[PDB]
Symmetry: D2
Subunit: 389 residues, 4 copies
């Protein structure tokens, strides 16, 4: 029975996935993807490429309607008619959307053709994760749609500049992405929500802080941790939580509107909010750790170098710059890393960097790599610790 074999495959893979940790499950997931691509027919390859696109548009519709939040609060299965009337959607349209969503697990369909939430329903109901999906639709899609004709018209140049990539064609502007976004309040509002998502795990799961501290003294009143472009301060909060007895100033640096958003959820004491533009010289002198998490991947080499050169004059011999970012391998990189590389090339002119490419960038700022502490697998995020040469 082919149905019996499929059911047994599902049982065994679900059991193997429970038998391991999140990194093992991520490896299983990538294997399932590779198996699919290798087992599909040629026609199914093109069908998959033609249709998987629709998931983002339909998630965006469900988000607009409030469907995922509503369904995640429902105590019993709901009919399409009930959902349509409650959310203000045409009954036929709602039925067709829900049938599509159930087929890609965006919701679950029951045996009597009613609907309940799935894991994906709950995910899309979370404001920060919903904002990530809406970002993909409104900011990533236009840039990817413009990229092939941009490259064709320009005879396939290497993209190296934030002011000369697919973004300018997609949005009919000469500004770079970050400058243009600052003029679009609806997009700024979505980014504000996006900043509330906290990635897990984080670098403190593997970072040997006491080892890296050595004999560094916080006395008289030195800074332990300067979180440069720290957003909502999640790194600062987790640091104080994990190391509540380590002395030294912990400083969140970001732009004033972001620091105001962060205030509601920062601890009452122990974390300073310091307005600071990281394109200017670093004001905090002689801190133990200057921390840059997912900052430098958004910038081409010239601008990333300037950010580092703004920090180096503040360092003393014991200071370290900690770059927490993606470190793809030299070969066999996975779709999350290479896909991110193509997207930030097209929107920002930047790139993902291997360890050798990080070291080459840091060397231009007078820095040398002392240690690298991986904390995710198989897609590598790592805290890279640099000192003065």
């Amino acid at each position: 029975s082919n149905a019996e074999t499929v059911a047994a495959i599902k049982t065994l893979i679900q059991q193997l996935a429970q038998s391991t940790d999140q990194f093992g499950r991520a490896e299983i997931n990538d294997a399932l993807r590779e198996l699919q691509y290798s087992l599909e027919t040629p026609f199914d390859t093109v069908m998959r490429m033609s249709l998987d696109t629709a998931q983002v548009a339909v998630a965006r519709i469900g988000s607009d309607l409030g469907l995922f939040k509503h369904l995640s609060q429902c105590a019993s299965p709901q009919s399409a008619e009930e959902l349509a009337d409650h959310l203000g959607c045409g009954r036929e349209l709602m039925s067709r959307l829900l049938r599509y969503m159930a087929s890609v697990r965006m919701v679950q369909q029951t045996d009597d053709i009613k609907y309940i939430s799935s894991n994906i329903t709950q995910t899309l109901a979370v404001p920060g994760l919903e904002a990530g999906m809406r970002h993909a639709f409104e900011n990533l899609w236009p840039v990817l749609m413009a990229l092939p004709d941009f490259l064709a018209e320009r005879k396939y140049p290497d993209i190296v500049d934030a002011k000369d990539t697919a973004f300018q064609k997609a949005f009919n502007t000469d500004q770079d992405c970050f400058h243009w976004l600052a003029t679009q309040p609806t997009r700024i509002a979505n980014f504000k929500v996006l900043l509330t998502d906290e990635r897990t795990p984080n670098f403190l799961s593997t970072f040997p802080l006491e080892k890296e501290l050595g004999s560094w003294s916080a006395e008289p009143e030195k800074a332990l941790f300067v979180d440069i472009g720290g957003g909502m301060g999640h790194a600062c909060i987790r640091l104080r939580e994990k190391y509540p007895n380590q002395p030294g100033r912990v400083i969140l640096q970001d732009l004033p509107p972001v620091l105001q958003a962060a205030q509601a959820t920062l601890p009452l004491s122990g974390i300073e909010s310091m307005p600071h533009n990281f394109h200017t010289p670093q004001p905090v002198q002689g801190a133990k750790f200057y921390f840059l998490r997912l900052i430098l991947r958004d910038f081409p080499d010239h601008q990333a170098l300037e950010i580092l050169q703004n920090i180096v004059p503040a360092m003393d011999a014991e200071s370290r710059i900690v770059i927490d970012d993606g470190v793809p391998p030299e070969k066999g990189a996975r779709w999350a890393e290479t896909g991110t590389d193509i997207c930030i090339m097209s929107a920002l002119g930047s790139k993902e960097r291997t360890q050798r490419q990080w070291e080459e960038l840091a060397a231009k700022a007078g820095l040398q790599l002392q240690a690298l502490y991986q904390y995710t697998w198989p897609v590598v995020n790592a805290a890279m610790v640099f000192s003065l040469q």
Copy 2:
């Protein structure tokens, strides 16, 4: 070992897949997709939705460069430098594109970071399949990108009309999709290549021709088979190949430029080419089978009914209309059926139809279902045989 477990999963799934037939492999692939969606983390759900989009854009770039056709005929692994110089691409751009393609199996990357064809490379090198991918990029993507805001601004109506759906917003026109496309030479040229793809299996694998004929007789120059909108005539060719001694005319009906393109590959005798617009009265009277394959799914009910009403006056008591099309189930429909439904809703105002919906449509034309012969699974395509009521 995580690597050892992952390799063992791949080995066992591959062995199970090779032991079943194409329909069993399709069921396995659908299960792998379901497992992937159920095992991903919330962040990975959003990352998947954010990035899987890039596959179509990068395939379009590879098609523009001629990369897949070139790699499919190479007899040894090629470096990114060699490919860039041969195809006229910037070397860094080519390297980043190839790394992305390898991570989604669009090519294969070797242990010394060179590149060879994968199954997907060969697929994208086939002109008809390449054309399907280009169609997804240039025709489906803009309509899907317009659908969420189209529905929002119109307060979520049921889409019922080809002249009032997302297409009009996407391409800034009041024309319906088919009328507009016929004004766009480059898009027409891609559709001509798309028609060269022949789907397998086909309805003749399960259609009981002898039983359906009964004592039918061709005595007065009558037609056995009229292929309405038959494209390149694949159904006529396969019919003559499988039943070479069955009497009766076999007639391919389409518009003149498609019949012209079909001539090169049609047999030199046995199949007549007859220009005919299926929005006009059917000229062939009393044929045994009037055959409509993947025609009516492109039209809303009102227009699909008019196509049928142009045939019914030509029928005698022995005539049958054979609708060969998708028959999604009442529940548990799969992503290929529901995804198609949402795309053709957005571009064409049409829909996929359950068996009951096909019967309701045909009844408005005065037709009754006599037999239904499935020939694919689990996504069902079937030849539905209708007679006069």
Copy 3:
């Protein structure tokens, strides 16, 4: 590749087995046995039955030579020549024995044809487990070899009497098994070593001692626990270890030579050693628990009933008899339970008993079942708690 498929099966089963507990692994092992029996060819069925017998004979030879104890303490692989010379075995004989042992995992053979311990080597080096294997060879095998012709010559009677079963034919005696064994010094010495094996888990993992005690009070030098035929006293030791502050005497009852052997490993206080023959009236009056673990399965109903009838006059209203023994199900019993049933039928005239059969036996002694506490699965051992009717 057959080798690759086989390796992948092993990897996946190993991973599934390590992800469950000991009871889950027992269920997996029973499924592997069932699969093996269902997938063997008819010839392989007979070959398996013909040859699996040799494992006991070869283990006995390895035990006689001291091979498993020696190999378990070796720090490097040993050649067959080295083992033969050390153990005093002909070199060709030793080589052929070791090749056989490696093929059934009794040792492991290395890639350069030397030998190291396997899990089974270590098992057969443990004195109590080695003694169980020697018992199978010298006591169980002769009775099983005599059973078919014993039943044939007697026209297939129900075996009901310890003095009239296959044992008498196998050892050419009119004595029952236990009486005869007590005349055979070498066999007695092996049983003494066998008693040093402690089964895990034990009944204290699920026995709700506090609930079963209720308001029981030890005030007049009363006994909490009387271990009847307790052997080395493992149940008394575990009880004192788990409930060190519970008042009440804890008493180990057995025959003098077994109590003597127990002294070396008993705690120096807290457990009394009391010589007592359980075929005679119980001397300890009004104890809370009279405990019989794996005693009554060795006796037919008439003798098991007499053992219980020697205890019941010592009971007061609060006393309980706790029978800790196998409780096979009414259907679907597993090979360990039914195999034991056939062996003890042939040697001892006794039987395994379902819960209903235990209740019927105990009712003849005027006892009623109050509670049953399983502590192993899927082959069930349980502590059955009986009170006066």
Copy 4:
């Protein structure tokens, strides 16, 4: 759910086993055995060794009762009571035997505690396979039971002589096994039935007969195939069946009582029956193939050599001796090969021989190996083709 996981393991292994051929299934079976042995607890190891022995005794009882033949003819499930009354067995004994048999798949137990035949029931109902089981019980078991004390009393000698092994102790005789068996009519009768079993596959599945023939001429009246000790002539029958047009005499040689048994099932023409004792000079001169299947493994080197030396003088330059027998590997031999080695050592003083050991034996007869044609895996049986040196 652990029950769900076990069910899925069974489904997937059953599907993998159907996806391959008999050799692949044999490899899977050996892997299942290895997994069991590696996953059992120490206690379960000794329990398995103690109890698996009982299968042979219980199969022997079922054979005595006619149970397997009766159940294999039953059209519906049978109760233990019905089976007991029909076969003349005590009702309790029958119930306990059937429960044991169901737990080792010797029969199947239904949900309402009735019994139906399994694959093993059908196997044990086949006369030749039943005879193999009865041989294991009455001839192999006594020799294995005597082997440990035989070796101990003799200080572990290398066994080299058919008149000085465990057989003489087991059966209290000074005769060798084959000479003693000739005086025991009940054992001779079982061997007669055993000879009717035909092993599959056979050497003709891979033997390149036309290649090995070369230009050999059967003219004037030469012998193609001389089946030395050919038993019922299965090799001769299959040869004539597969190669019906190859000329040349095909001659079955065996002892007169065996040739008389063979007559009923030999073809009416084309195969000669020739009484011949293979301890005397071969009478047929200059045959192309002198065939010895599973003959020489029953003899120590001295006697096996004499059998070959009786053939060599009959050979001309084109003659070949074909030894069809087991060829275990130099390392990693499997339980069927090593177990057979231990059994024939104990009963016959002989041995299984590697390819090098076959070549060394044949070289003493003036023979050289020309080709080796395997036809079973993973346990190797092969047709080894030898010519004059």
